[PDB]
Design a protein around this ligand. Sequence first.
Ligand SMILES: CC(=O)N[C@H]1[C@H](O[C@@H]2[C@@H](O)[C@H](O)O[C@H](CO)[C@@H]2O)O[C@H](CO[C@]2(C(=O)O)C[C@H](O)[C@@H](NC(C)=O)[C@H]([C@H](O)[C@H](O)CO)O2)[C@@H](O)[C@@H]1O[C@@H]1O[C@H](CO)[C@H](O)[C@H](O)[C@H]1O
Ligand SMILES: *[C@@H]1O[C@H](CO[C@@H]2O[C@@H](C)[C@@H](O)[C@@H](O)[C@@H]2O)[C@@H](O[C@@H]2O[C@H](CO)[C@@H](O[C@@H]3O[C@H](CO)[C@@H](O)[C@H](O)[C@@H]3O)[C@H](O)[C@H]2NC(C)=O)[C@H](O)[C@H]1NC(C)=O
Ligand SMILES: *[C@@H]1O[C@H](CO[C@@H]2O[C@@H](C)[C@@H](O)[C@@H](O)[C@@H]2O)[C@@H](O[C@@H]2O[C@H](CO)[C@@H](O[C@@H]3O[C@H](CO)[C@@H](O)[C@H](O)[C@@H]3O)[C@H](O)[C@H]2NC(C)=O)[C@H](O)[C@H]1NC(C)=O
Ligand SMILES: *[C@@H]1O[C@H](CO[C@@H]2O[C@@H](C)[C@@H](O)[C@@H](O)[C@@H]2O)[C@@H](O[C@@H]2O[C@H](CO)[C@@H](O[C@@H]3O[C@H](CO)[C@@H](O)[C@H](O)[C@@H]3O)[C@H](O)[C@H]2NC(C)=O)[C@H](O)[C@H]1NC(C)=O
Ligand SMILES: *[C@@H]1O[C@H](CO)[C@@H](O[C@@H]2O[C@H](CO)[C@@H](O[C@@H]3O[C@H](CO)[C@@H](O)[C@H](O)[C@@H]3O)[C@H](O)[C@H]2NC(C)=O)[C@H](O)[C@H]1NC(C)=O
Ligand SMILES: *[C@@H]1O[C@H](CO)[C@@H](O[C@@H]2O[C@H](CO)[C@@H](O[C@@H]3O[C@H](CO)[C@@H](O)[C@H](O)[C@@H]3O)[C@H](O)[C@H]2NC(C)=O)[C@H](O)[C@H]1NC(C)=O
Ligand SMILES: *[C@@H]1O[C@H](CO)[C@@H](O[C@@H]2O[C@H](CO)[C@@H](O[C@@H]3O[C@H](CO)[C@@H](O)[C@H](O)[C@@H]3O)[C@H](O)[C@H]2NC(C)=O)[C@H](O)[C@H]1NC(C)=O
Ligand SMILES: *[C@@H]1O[C@H](CO)[C@@H](O)[C@H](O)[C@H]1NC(C)=O
Ligand SMILES: *[C@@H]1O[C@H](CO)[C@@H](O)[C@H](O)[C@H]1NC(C)=O
Ligand SMILES: *[C@@H]1O[C@H](CO)[C@@H](O)[C@H](O)[C@H]1NC(C)=O
Ligand SMILES: [Ca+2]
Ligand SMILES: [Ca+2]
Ligand SMILES: [Ca+2]
Lengths: 167, 167, 167, 316, 316, 316
Amino acid sequence: AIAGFIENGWEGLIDGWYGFRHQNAQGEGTAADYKSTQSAIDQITGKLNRLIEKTNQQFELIDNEFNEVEKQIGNVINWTRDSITEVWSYNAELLVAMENQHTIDLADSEMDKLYERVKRQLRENAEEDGTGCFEIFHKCDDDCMASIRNNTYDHSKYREEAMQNRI
Amino acid sequence: AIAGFIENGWEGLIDGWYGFRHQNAQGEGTAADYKSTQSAIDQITGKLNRLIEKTNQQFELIDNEFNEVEKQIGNVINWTRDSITEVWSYNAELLVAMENQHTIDLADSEMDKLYERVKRQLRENAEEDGTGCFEIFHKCDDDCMASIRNNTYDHSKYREEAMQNRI
Amino acid sequence: AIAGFIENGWEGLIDGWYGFRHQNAQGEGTAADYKSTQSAIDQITGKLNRLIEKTNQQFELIDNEFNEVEKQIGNVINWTRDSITEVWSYNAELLVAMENQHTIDLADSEMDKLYERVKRQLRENAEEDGTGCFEIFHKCDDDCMASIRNNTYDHSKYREEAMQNRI
Amino acid sequence: DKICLGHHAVSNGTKVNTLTERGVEVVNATETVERTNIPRICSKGKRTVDLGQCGLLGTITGPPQCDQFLEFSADLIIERREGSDVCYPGKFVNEEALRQILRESGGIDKEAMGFTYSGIRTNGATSACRRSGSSFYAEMKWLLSNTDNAAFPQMTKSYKNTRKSPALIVWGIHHSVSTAEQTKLYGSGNKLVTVGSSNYQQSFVPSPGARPQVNGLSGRIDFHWLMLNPNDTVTFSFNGAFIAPDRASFLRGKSMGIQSGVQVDANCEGDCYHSGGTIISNLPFQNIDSRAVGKCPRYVKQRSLLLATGMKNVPE
Amino acid sequence: DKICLGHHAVSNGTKVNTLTERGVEVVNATETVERTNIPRICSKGKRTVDLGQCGLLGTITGPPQCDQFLEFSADLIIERREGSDVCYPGKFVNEEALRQILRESGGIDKEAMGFTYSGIRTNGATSACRRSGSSFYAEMKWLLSNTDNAAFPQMTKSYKNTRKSPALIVWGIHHSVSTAEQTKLYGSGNKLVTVGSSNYQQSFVPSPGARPQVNGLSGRIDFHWLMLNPNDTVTFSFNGAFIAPDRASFLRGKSMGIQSGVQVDANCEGDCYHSGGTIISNLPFQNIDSRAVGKCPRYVKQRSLLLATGMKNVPE
Amino acid sequence: DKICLGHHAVSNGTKVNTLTERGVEVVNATETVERTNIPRICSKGKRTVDLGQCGLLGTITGPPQCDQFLEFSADLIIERREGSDVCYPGKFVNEEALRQILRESGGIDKEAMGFTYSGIRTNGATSACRRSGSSFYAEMKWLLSNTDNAAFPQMTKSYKNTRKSPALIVWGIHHSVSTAEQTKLYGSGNKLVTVGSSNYQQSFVPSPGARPQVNGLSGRIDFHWLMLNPNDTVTFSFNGAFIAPDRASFLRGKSMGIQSGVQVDANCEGDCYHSGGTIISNLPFQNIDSRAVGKCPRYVKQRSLLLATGMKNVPE
Ligand SMILES: CC(=O)N[C@H]1[C@H](O[C@@H]2[C@@H](O)[C@H](O)O[C@H](CO)[C@@H]2O)O[C@H](CO[C@]2(C(=O)O)C[C@H](O)[C@@H](NC(C)=O)[C@H]([C@H](O)[C@H](O)CO)O2)[C@@H](O)[C@@H]1O[C@@H]1O[C@H](CO)[C@H](O)[C@H](O)[C@H]1O
Ligand SMILES: *[C@@H]1O[C@H](CO[C@@H]2O[C@@H](C)[C@@H](O)[C@@H](O)[C@@H]2O)[C@@H](O[C@@H]2O[C@H](CO)[C@@H](O[C@@H]3O[C@H](CO)[C@@H](O)[C@H](O)[C@@H]3O)[C@H](O)[C@H]2NC(C)=O)[C@H](O)[C@H]1NC(C)=O
Ligand SMILES: *[C@@H]1O[C@H](CO[C@@H]2O[C@@H](C)[C@@H](O)[C@@H](O)[C@@H]2O)[C@@H](O[C@@H]2O[C@H](CO)[C@@H](O[C@@H]3O[C@H](CO)[C@@H](O)[C@H](O)[C@@H]3O)[C@H](O)[C@H]2NC(C)=O)[C@H](O)[C@H]1NC(C)=O
Ligand SMILES: *[C@@H]1O[C@H](CO[C@@H]2O[C@@H](C)[C@@H](O)[C@@H](O)[C@@H]2O)[C@@H](O[C@@H]2O[C@H](CO)[C@@H](O[C@@H]3O[C@H](CO)[C@@H](O)[C@H](O)[C@@H]3O)[C@H](O)[C@H]2NC(C)=O)[C@H](O)[C@H]1NC(C)=O
Ligand SMILES: *[C@@H]1O[C@H](CO)[C@@H](O[C@@H]2O[C@H](CO)[C@@H](O[C@@H]3O[C@H](CO)[C@@H](O)[C@H](O)[C@@H]3O)[C@H](O)[C@H]2NC(C)=O)[C@H](O)[C@H]1NC(C)=O
Ligand SMILES: *[C@@H]1O[C@H](CO)[C@@H](O[C@@H]2O[C@H](CO)[C@@H](O[C@@H]3O[C@H](CO)[C@@H](O)[C@H](O)[C@@H]3O)[C@H](O)[C@H]2NC(C)=O)[C@H](O)[C@H]1NC(C)=O
Ligand SMILES: *[C@@H]1O[C@H](CO)[C@@H](O[C@@H]2O[C@H](CO)[C@@H](O[C@@H]3O[C@H](CO)[C@@H](O)[C@H](O)[C@@H]3O)[C@H](O)[C@H]2NC(C)=O)[C@H](O)[C@H]1NC(C)=O
Ligand SMILES: *[C@@H]1O[C@H](CO)[C@@H](O)[C@H](O)[C@H]1NC(C)=O
Ligand SMILES: *[C@@H]1O[C@H](CO)[C@@H](O)[C@H](O)[C@H]1NC(C)=O
Ligand SMILES: *[C@@H]1O[C@H](CO)[C@@H](O)[C@H](O)[C@H]1NC(C)=O
Ligand SMILES: [Ca+2]
Ligand SMILES: [Ca+2]
Ligand SMILES: [Ca+2]
């Protein structure tokens, strides 16, 4: 009944953006991965820092709300202003559309990087179940689970046993 | 003589964008995957819906084709119009270039997702041949081929036999 | 003491953008992969060809540096010019930011493609060490190393021996 | 036994550009810049006025060509190269501002100004404004001395705008060929025309002087205008050389105006026009005409920009 | 025994748009278009002048409403709908150009021009410019004949700009109701006002003529101006109908000016204003007002554009 | 035994910006904003005219400084700060419109207008237009009464444009220091100059009046112009204060004009100029000068924007 990112997200994960969920004899447990969370957050924070910019350019009135300017120049001014408004309106729709596509793909890409990193820690001791989990082919207690999480799992320790169990 | 996407595309695949091509004792057969095709098409359709937009902004003449306006204002108008044309011409070249790069990568990315999904269905019963195919290490009849295609292949059924054949 | 791209780049690689570094009985050696280098370079060259473009549009003075134009029209001209400058300044910051994101991801993506290609040449004769290297489970002399590099390595030749060594 | 994954390809691939490559082939592509023009003015669903030989400013002064349009209503107004605002030679001052007002006016509704006169002729006419023989602008009156050379009584006439909208007021100054002609018409002495509102006073002097015959006449009547605001009054003081308005104009509502040299077509619908026709397209860009007006794709310099609608084409 | 990798999700997902999809849900999003207006003019840190009933051009001529501002200093200048540049009826010619100069002026410093007079009245006044009874523009002098009907001596007065900055010079022409009134004031004969500098000569004629009473008066004084350059001289020659400047104006430094219908508030700080208040935002875009001025987010048409600040939301 | 895949890196990495990070190091990068200016006007391949002390509008009226350029031909025209259009004091009305027409003209070809005269002096001259002593504008004639104070016969002179191109016509009005001077030259009485074409009638009055001495003279000659169309005629009627054209001008073809304060250099080639030199670059942007003209990179505010041309730099 435990599943990974291929299926869906986890509502229960509140300490982080990405995490680990394990199942062993001692039961179920979930824990956030700090590094991949922060990586993602910082890239988003970097978007914000760039998009929450202020122009330092000052513009002044060329127009008069109370006493309307001469019609010819007014029509040129309005045309120019409306053209500029079209340009910025298009730029702003595009900016957000594009940044959102990128933000989404970026976050997915961090998920993939974590998955791939664990796959490579586990070497020949586990198999991909297809839902974003690894079936580990040896007994993995809370301590062995924690060692996968903090990147200290030594696949040699369990290899002999695991490869034997995969047959 | 059968090969996958790493080598090239398939001219013979007309029912879909992505597909399966198999070789067994009963021979060769090709079939479209509907889901990944549709996913791709819908993302493209979503681009079109966004880029086939109409401006709701109306512009009027500030200029006269029959009786030329006063030269100073005409020159300001033409300069403004030409500047705007440069902006839009650059925006349109960029839009298409960028959307095309994305469309291409997107389609490739759906191919990869399908490949990865099959790889994970097959588990320890097949190996990547390097051209986008799996050498399956057990007898796989038209029914076993169809079960890979429709996501019902149960790798346990064939594991014993397949792992034995991989040595 | 030898490591791959997951860890970091190689200052010692000067004949190319991507490469192979091996360790066998005959020692250590590094060699550039020409194809993946060129692929990357050509994509960058393609960016340059597109961004090093000249406008064919000529603009003329609407303004006078020596004898200032009438104030109303001058203020309209300055407003228009400043608006255009904002547009271009934003376009240029965006162009570079976006192209740089893409260039970086592109180069990473070529690295991944090469890695994946070697992984698939080696089939069941090697394992991923997690740092961008493969531990090869048979004796691989300078000639076997060169055959991995130039895409002629025949995994069948060594399979028997390698699979035996992986247990 | 084996299974492969693949994707489609075709022999008819189309080239497109990307951030990295010119002419990468893809399976399918669609144009993004509109090149296809309909050489008609697609007017369906709009009250259209094809002004023909009537120039738009003539709808206000009413030379013979414009008789049908003195009170026209329109959603779409078409000007033509052949249209003249004028029968007797001359022009409007600030013409283009005024043209722009009338293009978006919806049309015009005329109202009498109520001027009447004593001690003067009111029947000034010319062979240049031909109806049933010599005539004049329908909406104006060429005021003249009661007889040749005779003195033109100094006069004042005022008109108040009762409506809730600004009234377009128009008048004209007659510039005679010679001070001798300007005396025949309005008597000797200097001539002056003062035009006062609350937000506008201005003087006008006829400048008689020789000039080329246009239509065989060397006279010119030049038209001036102003917007009189709701409840405001315009006052006209003059002793000659004044071409007086009979009627004032109020703008009806909303319209768009274009200039064009092609036929109207009430069957096709369109919202983006230019002199050579109508651009019907959902494409975001067009390379037909930079001066297109209405609701339009944005004009770009390039003839073509293909947008990939399929994947890379990798045939064997 | 098993370990899974996952990512978070929530029940409160927000929809955003991407290159490929409308309304893809994400874990978090932030607005990018500012809609929130503060209906006050946030003036903190700026020397503000709320001109009230004083129109900005009146600070130069000095009708009663503008008495407090004849030499005003400001970083920020606020004009109001109720402000009039004028006591006696009339207007400035090239008004908007001048307004624009004064909005960025920083304020003005007046300097006496040194004109004095003989053989004429200098005390022209009107009930329309009310101080302690009839009065006139503080910075001008209505010159009149020494007595009713009497001849107005042809005069010349010149003024040189000693400072290192251009001097704003202003004068007025009086347009009487009738040549009979223009004779009472300045005597019979034709009236002419010639205004010469090095880079400017121009003539001005009073055009007397009937026109609507504004404030019960049918007279108009219309104001003209020019920039006199450092070391340049302006010369005025006239035999009547001249409203002479007493003082010239020099622009102080730098300011910004706006038009507005809401209260000043010296507590909040702002840099982007519009008639209806102040836009305080770091967002790159706004949908409040296209004519906003100062340092502003760029105006866009759309009310909302959400920028994803989290990943796709895939709940179970 | 083992094989690794890697990529290169360097110690000299350069920082660039991306959508997500400021200052990510990459292996190589190239500038995209041009800062490098050549302080010369690179004129190679173009017929260049450095106008020097001759102001561009003087090429039409011909004061002494412009004698070499009365019929100049050019692909590129350079104006200089020191250039004056004028010898006798005054200016062109609508100067900037006219300047813009001449900058793109290709140069000018003069044609005689064929005017001749009786009963008047034609030799009006001034010490301000110095050739071999007192002289005048080469292309104009200062018409004067046959003797001091004497009456200036009312005259008419007309000129038709025979060519297939519009003719630039120019004339001048003399504004005397005093009505007493204007009488010495042209006799007493009021003076009037009427200038009629088919699409243009206008009056001009000299406004004599005291004003500052420029070059020791308080007179001004101000120049007016019009485009006469193919087959059109311009008529001039006057009784004094008229500065008559001798020749009309036709625009040659195509040119570009700039204003500049640096040397010409016929060795380097350039297409993008500004007052301080030439911008030679294929970069798409520049931060040198917003008023650059020709075929130019687009001006941006930023000094630098580096475009990565290599991968991320990850050294050990
Ligand atoms: C020599 C001669 O008789 N010239 C008259 C001139 O001649 C032509 C006609 O005879 C011919 O049949 O038709 C063409 C038209 O294409 C010639 O014009 O006609 C002019 C034009 O005059 C009218 C007009 O507009 O049709 C007559 C109008 O009634 C009149 N309108 C008024 C009085 O308000 C109008 C005006 O006088 C002018 O439009 C104002 O500029 O002119 C006719 O005037 C010619 O008569 C000569 O007039 C000149 C003054 O230029 C002078 O008094 C001569 O002594 C007189 O013969
Ligand atoms: C690449 O190729 C396909 C198929 O191409 C075609 O097959 C042969 C008969 C050729 O000789 C070609 O002439 C023909 O295009 C393209 O799809 C096809 O496009 C056509 C033309 O647009 C479609 O026509 C539609 O069908 C009706 C019926 O007569 C027409 O009247 C309509 O006007 C309508 O456009 C047709 O449906 C379609 N055929 C198939 C099998 O899909 C494809 O567009 C092309 N791609 C590119 C990028 O060029
Ligand atoms: C999706 O959900 C979370 C949690 O939202 C909330 O939880 C419940 C109590 C609800 O009934 C909601 O009322 C509540 O929003 C959002 O994060 C939360 O945002 C809120 C609102 O901005 C924060 O509220 C705080 O409230 C006080 C006012 O008394 C302010 O002074 C604080 O500065 C702050 O704004 C709250 O801190 C925050 N909660 C947590 C645990 O992070 C989340 O933003 C939302 N998604 C989106 C897109 O909005
Ligand atoms: C990162 O570094 C390399 C190498 O830098 C070079 O090595 C050392 C001697 C240093 O102390 C540096 O001074 C030196 O540049 C850069 O590539 C090298 O660039 C240089 C400078 O442009 C090239 O020099 C040549 O110089 C002559 C002029 O005498 C020109 O005519 C040549 O056309 C050329 O410009 C040199 O070719 C090149 N060297 C190699 C081996 O490729 C590299 O560009 C740099 N990264 C960045 C972003 O600048
Ligand atoms: C190649 O790409 C083209 C262009 O993207 C495809 O043609 C497009 O097909 C879609 C539907 O698949 C069309 O949408 C249609 O809208 C119209 C009118 O608005 C409606 O009447 C239709 O029923 C449909 O929903 C779209 O208009 C059409 N575009 C063009 C320019 O023709 C085509 O599908 C692709 N070809 C192949 C072989 O896949
Ligand atoms: C959902 O996204 C929103 C919007 O992006 C997040 O709110 C934002 O959070 C950042 C990080 O805390 C805020 O930065 C703040 O700004 C200044 C400068 O550093 C400082 O005074 C604050 O202490 C803080 O650092 C940012 O202003 C704020 N933006 C908005 C519009 O409110 C929010 O964190 C996200 N929600 C969750 C649950 O993660
Ligand atoms: C670091 O990156 C820059 C890329 O911007 C490299 O400099 C560029 O090198 C290319 C390829 O040599 C140059 O193209 C050249 O074009 C000219 C003129 O068209 C031609 O005559 C040359 O033979 C060549 O094809 C490009 O001009 C040059 N750009 C600049 C701004 O100098 C540089 O080589 C890279 N460094 C390393 C170490 O790779
Ligand atoms: C210019 O725009 C304003 C609204 O911003 C509008 O009220 C005004 O009428 C416009 N002018 C014309 C001539 O349509
Ligand atoms: C402005 O552009 C039009 C064509 O769009 C052209 O015919 C005209 O010459 C231009 N105006 C000037 C003053 O050069
Ligand atoms: C227009 O811009 C220039 C600088 O490009 C500046 O010197 C000039 O004063 C500006 N005009 C006004 C009226 O502020
Ligand atoms: Ca009516
Ligand atoms: Ca003072
Ligand atoms: Ca010649």
